[PDB]
Design a protein around this ligand. Sequence first.
Ligand SMILES: O=C1N[C@H](c2c(CNCCCCCCNCc3[nH]c4ccccc4c3[C@H]3NC(=O)c4ccc(O)cc43)[nH]c3ccccc23)c2cc(O)ccc21
Ligand SMILES: O=C1N[C@H](c2c(CNCCCCCCNCc3[nH]c4ccccc4c3[C@H]3NC(=O)c4ccc(O)cc43)[nH]c3ccccc23)c2cc(O)ccc21
Ligand SMILES: Nc1nc2c(ncn2[C@@H]2O[C@H](COP(=O)(O)OP(=O)(O)O)[C@@H](O)[C@H]2O)c(=O)[nH]1
Ligand SMILES: Nc1nc2c(ncn2[C@@H]2O[C@H](COP(=O)(O)OP(=O)(O)O)[C@@H](O)[C@H]2O)c(=O)[nH]1
Ligand SMILES: Nc1nc2c(ncn2[C@@H]2O[C@H](COP(=O)(O)OP(=O)(O)O)[C@@H](O)[C@H]2O)c(=O)[nH]1
Ligand SMILES: [Mg+2]
Ligand SMILES: [Mg+2]
Ligand SMILES: [Mg+2]
Lengths: 163, 160, 164
Amino acid sequence: MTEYKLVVVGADGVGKSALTIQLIQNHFVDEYDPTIEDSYRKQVVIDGETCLLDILDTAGSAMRDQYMRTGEGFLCVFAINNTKSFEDIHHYREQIKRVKDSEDVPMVLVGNKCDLPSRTVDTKQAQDLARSYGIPFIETSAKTRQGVDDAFYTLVREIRKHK
Amino acid sequence: MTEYKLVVVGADGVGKSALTIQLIQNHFVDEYDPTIEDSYRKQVVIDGETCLLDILDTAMRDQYMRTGEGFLCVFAINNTKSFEDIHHYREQIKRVKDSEDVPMVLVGNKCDLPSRTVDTKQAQDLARSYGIPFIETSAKTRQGVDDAFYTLVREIRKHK
Amino acid sequence: MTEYKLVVVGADGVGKSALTIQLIQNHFVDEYDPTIEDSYRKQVVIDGETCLLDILDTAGQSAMRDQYMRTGEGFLCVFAINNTKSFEDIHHYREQIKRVKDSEDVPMVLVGNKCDLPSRTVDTKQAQDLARSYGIPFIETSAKTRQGVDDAFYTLVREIRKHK
Ligand SMILES: O=C1N[C@H](c2c(CNCCCCCCNCc3[nH]c4ccccc4c3[C@H]3NC(=O)c4ccc(O)cc43)[nH]c3ccccc23)c2cc(O)ccc21
Ligand SMILES: O=C1N[C@H](c2c(CNCCCCCCNCc3[nH]c4ccccc4c3[C@H]3NC(=O)c4ccc(O)cc43)[nH]c3ccccc23)c2cc(O)ccc21
Ligand SMILES: Nc1nc2c(ncn2[C@@H]2O[C@H](COP(=O)(O)OP(=O)(O)O)[C@@H](O)[C@H]2O)c(=O)[nH]1
Ligand SMILES: Nc1nc2c(ncn2[C@@H]2O[C@H](COP(=O)(O)OP(=O)(O)O)[C@@H](O)[C@H]2O)c(=O)[nH]1
Ligand SMILES: Nc1nc2c(ncn2[C@@H]2O[C@H](COP(=O)(O)OP(=O)(O)O)[C@@H](O)[C@H]2O)c(=O)[nH]1
Ligand SMILES: [Mg+2]
Ligand SMILES: [Mg+2]
Ligand SMILES: [Mg+2]
């Protein structure tokens, strides 16, 4: 069975752990220690092909470069009520591009917390950024699970197209 | 013995030759003809490993960019234009070597002078956007000179 | 933690499963279903560096085979010292791995298993000569006594580290 290493990145508090555990366990965690960096496996079917997801939920330089080199695709998560988290995204894109020395790393832009009313990042703004990178943009709520499968499955499709 | 081809680039007058000759000879040259482009060797020990530095002191540029393994991008701290040239060097090297991760060090030379026009924070932010180190040097006093070249070698080593 | 994907290949009955379970569990299995192809993880320290071994114990010996050869980073090529045919198979495994990975220098270790049995038909010198012709190490093992088992897998990890 084919296996894909996916890395979830983004600023503190955006929902990386909540998204990861929703995908892996169909479980919503309200309180997850922000210092724990762990990986999880799940077997899924995407477009009729069974594969194993190996998902790194990043927390906090040498160690960072290492998991960027072995990761095959990246979920770049911001929170739609936190403009700083959205303005940080380009730093993640730039680091990944440099560490993997590639202009075409499989990546998906994720706008999390879409269930909340206090939106400060426009959808159009995130769509425009994703379009400048030529990557998909998916809005998620780890709380309701809306868009969660979409974000990870779309990342796998990006890896498959790249190969 | 492993050898490393290093290329010193930067605007006229920033101190490329003075830095190169301080590294190679432990000698400060006050003048040095600005038209002379030459290479120099020196055997050094870095992190317990003996290696040969092959350093090109620049005045096709494409040829030596392709051959060079790491680049010292030098500006002078009292010359704002030389700092504004830095991004042009980075973009050329990136294109010619076709890589987003070329071993590079940003060098702010002439740190002994008082007439500073480029802020340390400004150069630090630029290096940080490139993911490369920033080292302030004085080829006149030799402060930071070994640090700049040795750090560049360490960048090459990590890359491989 | 760095992770290494290692693949154990060789003819039916040479001891691939017995070797893998000795490494992972410190346990000798006298009978293990020859049809089961599975992978196992173990965290080990080699030369002061902690790493995760992810070891595929191959059973059937085309498309899935090509897949795990492309994914595997290093290969234990196992024969049994009382089975000349299994030794004559080795060059076929080497040629397949070379083709599938498109590389003349794939990390590999030649393993001569069952060194505890008396009915040897493959000479140590014969195996050393073959390994020398490939530029890879040769390690004699017994999955029964566990002699050489750590050596075979650790040496393969060292080959991967040197290749990188
Ligand atoms: O694609 C195939 N995979 C197969 C296979 C397996 C099974 N694998 C099961 C997962 C095991 C996860 C182990 C924790 N993996 C942990 C994990 N998950 C991540 C997710 C993203 C990024 C990094 C990681 C890591 C980290 N790994 C690093 O090196 C690292 C560095 C710094 C970090 O900080 C984090 C990490 N074992 C094999 C051994 C040989 C050949 C093939 C295989 C297989 C068989 C087959 O017939 C056909 C195809 C395939
Ligand atoms: O790593 C090893 N090196 C070893 C070795 C040597 C020694 N070499 C030392 C002389 C150094 C040349 C001095 C000109 N080198 C001149 C020089 N220095 C530079 C620095 C940066 C960029 C370019 C250059 C150049 C230029 N070369 C170009 O193509 C070019 C284009 C445009 C320009 O304008 C400038 C240049 N000779 C060998 C022959 C075969 C195999 C190995 C070697 C060795 C032996 C060994 O047992 C184990 C390991 C190694
Ligand atoms: N309302 C809402 N809250 C969320 C969502 N995702 C995460 N959270 C909350 O935001 C906080 C930070 O989540 P966490 O998973 O720890 O974020 P991390 O630091 O990126 O790992 C936690 O209180 C979560 O319960 C979401 O989609 N909607
Ligand atoms: N005060 C001071 N002067 C320097 C330093 N480095 C170079 N210079 C002087 O600046 C001028 C240009 O130096 P040079 O090495 O020829 O620059 P290049 O054109 O980049 O090769 C010379 O007069 C040098 O003596 C330094 O660190 N401090
Ligand atoms: N005496 C001895 N028997 C072994 C050794 N390794 C494996 N065996 C036995 O040889 C048979 C085949 O082993 P197995 O692990 O199933 O081989 P595989 O088909 O390559 O996976 C089993 O009966 C094992 O107990 C060894 O080093 N010494
Ligand atoms: Mg977290
Ligand atoms: Mg000069
Ligand atoms: Mg078996």
